[PDB]
T-cell receptor, first 242, second 204 residues
Framework: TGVSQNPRHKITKRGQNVTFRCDPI?????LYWYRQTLGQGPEFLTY????????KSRLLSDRFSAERPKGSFSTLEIQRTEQGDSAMYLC???????????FGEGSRLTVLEDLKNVFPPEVAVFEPSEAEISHTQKATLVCLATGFYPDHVELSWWVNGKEVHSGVCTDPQPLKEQPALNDSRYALSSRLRVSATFWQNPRNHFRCQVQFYGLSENDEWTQDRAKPVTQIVSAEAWGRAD | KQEVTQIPAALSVPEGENLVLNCSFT??????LQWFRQDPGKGLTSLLL?????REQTSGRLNASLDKSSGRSTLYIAASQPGDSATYLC???????????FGSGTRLLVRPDIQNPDPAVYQLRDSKSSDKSVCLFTDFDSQTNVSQSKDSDVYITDKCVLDMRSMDFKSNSAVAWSNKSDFACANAFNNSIIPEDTFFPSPE
């Protein structure tokens, strides 16, 4: 039903090779590769009509290659990655009969100088103020994720084992813990608001979950700290009767 | 040769207002134009597609015009909702080329209409055993902006809208924190222009 891409993220050190896979909407004869950097618009990479690669950005490096062997799925390979390769890699497909492009969720590539700057988040949940409860009859929890690099995180709220969206908002962008430096670690916050009566039930369980897209297991690691692999870091609170 | 321009680069509007997004292109030899919406860090969703010979297309609260000879397209969004907040991108496909050439996008934010503002700054303590806390500025109307701190050891987030959907209740908030000794929620947002009646609660 939708365009699928594997993987969602990939961190890489300079010089390494990377391969992304795209699966179009069933039977779509036209497939496109694009990439996009933050704050800008998508830039064209390549076009396939069935198996044949009909158009390719003239400026794009020969290090970039794409193939679509049987039509259908396509891979995009980047050899000897450079920092400048860092972007969201978008795949799109279209049917022969209509011009509408359907996009995948993207593959986020971050190519870094050295992997020693990669850090997972620390996560903490801060409980509602008694003053907020008295004043508004509502209760806001705050989740803070701090000290992560690069900024590849998804934060979610879980109430009694169920993901919630209502009463939630998460900062649009992380802030830098040192806005000047290029390799500053990041911090991100989110709020979950519930009624005071819901907070005041001690059986109610609140969890903030932060998914971090980090290193693989094929990445070399020789630091004493834990390898900053892709992981979930969470924190939690329970309701308080008053 | 083709250059696609979008203005404004960024747009903030009160919920309920109609809005106008502009796209320009220097080469009129286009085959079609397509508008997309992007939730940042994800993919694009097609909104409208207008053929070079067509003058208009509509879908729900969305309507777009095309003047191919003028090298212009306009996207109209009626009765804006905070859920419309996204990046809106314009792209053209050229005669005898298969690729789409994209503009840089308009970053749209639709600010909630706060029915009963109750601006306040609360202190929240860590659920885990520690000395840590944060300051929450909340319940201010959408005209209020949250500024960065004079002090670089103080972290302050941008404002954020949450929707308590079943309650038909929206509220704005921002969070501040710091490791420094003299940090207090009473002074955390001192550099922002905040309502004069902002509530600062006593001992817990």
């Amino acid at each position: 039903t939708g365009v699928s891409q594997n993987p969602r993220h990939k961190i890489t050190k300079r010089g390494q090779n990377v391969t992304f896979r795209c699966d179009p909407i069933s039977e779509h004869n036209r497939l496109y590769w694009y990439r996009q950097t933050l704050g800008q618009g998508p830039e064209f990479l390549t076009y396939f009509q069935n198996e044949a690669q009909l158009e390719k950005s003239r400026l794009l490096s020969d290090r970039f290659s794409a193939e679509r062997p049987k039509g259908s799925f396509s891979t995009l390979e980047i050899q000897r990655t450079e920092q400048g390769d860092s972007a969201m890699y978008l795949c799109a497909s279209s049917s022969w009969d209509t011009g509408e492009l359907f996009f995948g969720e993207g593959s986020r590539l971050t190519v870094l100088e050295d992997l020693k700057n990669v850090f997972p988040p620390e996560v903490a949940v801060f409980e509602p103020s008694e003053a907020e409860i008295s004043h508004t009859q509502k209760a806001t929890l705050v989740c803070l994720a701090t000290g992560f690099y690069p900024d590849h995180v998804e934060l979610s709220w879980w109430v009694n084992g169920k993901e919630v969206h209502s009463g939630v908002c998460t900062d649009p962008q992380p802030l830098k813990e040192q806005p000047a430096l290029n390799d500053s670690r990041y911090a991100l916050s989110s709020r979950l608001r519930v009624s005071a009566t819901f907070w005041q039930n001690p059986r109610n369980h609140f969890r903030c979950q932060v998914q971090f897209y980090g290193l693989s297991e094929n990445d070399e690691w020789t630091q004493d700290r834990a390898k900053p692999v892709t992981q979930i870091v969470s924190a939690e609170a329970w309701g308080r009767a008053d | 040769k083709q250059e696609v321009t979008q203005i404004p680069a960024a747009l903030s509007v009160p919920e309920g207002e109609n809005l106008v997004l502009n796209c320009s292109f220097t080469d009129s030899a286009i085959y079609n134009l397509q508008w997309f919406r992007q939730d940042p860090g994800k993919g694009l969703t097609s909104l409208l597609l207008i053929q070079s010979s067509q003058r208009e297309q509509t879908s729900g609260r969305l309507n777009a015009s095309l003047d191919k000879s003028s090298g212009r397209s306009t996207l109209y969004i009626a009765a804006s909702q905070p859920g419309d907040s996204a990046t809106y991108l314009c792209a053209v496909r050229m005669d005898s080329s298969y690729k789409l050439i994209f503009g840089s996008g308009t970053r749209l934010l639709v600010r909630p209409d706060i029915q009963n503002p109750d601006p306040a700054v609360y202190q929240l303590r860590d659920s885990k055993s520690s000395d840590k806390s944060v300051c929450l500025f909340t319940d201010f109307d959408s005209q209020t902006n949250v500024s960065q701190s004079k002090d670089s050891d103080v972290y302050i987030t941008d404002k954020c809208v949450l929707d308590m959907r079943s309650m038909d209740f929206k509220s704005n908030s921002a969070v501040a924190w710091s490791n420094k000794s003299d940090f207090a929620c009473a002074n955390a947002f001192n550099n922002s222009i905040i309502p004069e009646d902002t509530f600062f609660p006593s001992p817990e």
